[PDB]
Ligand binder design. Sequence first.
Ligand SMILES: [Zn+2]
Ligand SMILES: [Zn+2]
Ligand SMILES: [Zn+2]
Length: 131
Amino acid sequence: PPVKGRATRQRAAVSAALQEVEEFRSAQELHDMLKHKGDAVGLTTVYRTLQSLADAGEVDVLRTAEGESVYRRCSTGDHHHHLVCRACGKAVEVEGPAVEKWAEAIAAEHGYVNVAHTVEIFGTCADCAGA
DNA sequence: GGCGACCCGGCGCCCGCTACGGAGTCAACTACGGGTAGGGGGTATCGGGCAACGCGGCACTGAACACCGTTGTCATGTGCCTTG
Ligand SMILES: [Zn+2]
Ligand SMILES: [Zn+2]
Ligand SMILES: [Zn+2]
């Protein structure tokens, strides 16, 4: 996980933590689990590295209803949409050219120069209903 | 043949401190052979110089709620006037 800044142990540690975690997480709870591992990193520094990862683009970023920004990394480079369960957090990556063509067609119809789509589908889990 | 002088060796010492001069010297040679040590040449290893980047207080982000404060508001109750 290369970063724009000079490599060191702490960015490697947070990158490895993101690698192990395959769920949507917030910065504060990410720091909580990171401290639980025992690295004892700083809050604001963790912010810098996660922000850098979001800027780099190798980690997707989502915004919750509460307004918190949450992050998680994706195995595949190409763009995709993550279906996520609020209770579980199971993020599954899917993509469809139909929505892309729809966006381009709308942009052309309205004479828009450039666009950027943000589509996230929320829903109820299959196993959450079961008990 | 122990005494005896005597003889000889052999040794022992020979007041105190400061303060006060220098001086320094006569008779082989070569060949080899190694080994250490020096020199430079090149090389792995340690040490010195810079911005992010760890942190933390608080600060802003006010956003999003909460805490009283307020004049919105309502359907529903007294007091006077008209008619039983
Ligand atoms: Zn993604
Ligand atoms: Zn998409
Ligand atoms: Zn679920």
